[PDB]
Design a protein around this ligand. Structure first.
Ligand SMILES: [Zn+2]
Ligand SMILES: [Zn+2]
Length: 228
């Protein structure tokens, strides 16, 4: 781990890092949220903001110091603060931003700023490619409703990594957590669909646990079976 101001950065692969930021949730402590940073040749791609604009600007500062290449785009994985709270910092920096169309629709009511561009998805869950131009190795998949109605997931081609966002918890998790906007009926199937979309991913990254094996997916789905 690298502590950089109030954030933590961890290299996961030669061209992939996890960013971690924290917010006090009165009654729950200082809650960590993870996202990703990917170098694709001469540019950088970001998955998820930090909780705040100031923290997100710090992610960009870390990128400047540790990678020193332009950030071509960011994709955010649903309309909650941990994933979209720093949109204005991305826009101030001139970075093109993307989210599920449904996340952009929900953003104002959730207290978020919408991304500039909307992703749409085929019936099988894969992003419609025209809506995710220049995404390089980022493979975006809508697994179905689960943690939220709008949650999306991202695989990183050329690596063994897939990012479940807030949909997936690690294999030792006692409970799922953060179920306020969850689709309890469909959660298990959506977790399993994420796994099936990225069958070769042996490192599962997620918002509220450290990286784990694919047991994160099976355990999450088994936990979600109890919601039905
Ligand atoms: Zn959430
Ligand atoms: Zn979350």
């Amino acid at each position: 781990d690298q502590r950089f101001g109030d954030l933590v950065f961890r290299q996961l692969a030669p061209n992939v890092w996890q960013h971690t930021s924290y917010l006090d949730m009165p009654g729950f402590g200082a809650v960590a949220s993870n996202g990703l940073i990917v170098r694709d040749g001469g540019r950088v791609l970001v998955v998820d903001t930090a909780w705040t604009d100031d923290q997100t600007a710090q992610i960009l500062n870390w990128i400047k110091q540790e990678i020193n290449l332009p950030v071509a785009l960011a994709v955010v994985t649903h309309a909650h603060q941990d994933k979209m709270g720093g949109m204005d910092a991305l826009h101030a920096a001139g970075i093109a931003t993307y989210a599920n169309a449904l996340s952009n629709q929900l953003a104002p009511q959730e207290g978020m700023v919408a991304a500039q561009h909307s992703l749409t998805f085929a019936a099988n869950g894969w992003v419609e490619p025209a809506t995710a131009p220049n995404f390089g190795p980022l493979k975006v998949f809508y697994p179905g409703p689960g943690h939220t109605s709008d949650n999306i997931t991202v695989g990183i081609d050329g690596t063994d990594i897939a990012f479940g966002g807030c949909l997936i918890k690690d294999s030792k998790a006692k409970s799922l957590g953060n179920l306020g906007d969850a689709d309890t009926e469909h959660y298990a199937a959506s977790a399993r669909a994420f796994g099936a979309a990225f069958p070769k991913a042996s490192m599962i990254v997620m918002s509220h646990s450290a990286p784990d094996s694919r047991a994160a997916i099976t355990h999450t789905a088994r936990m979600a079976d109890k919601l039905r």
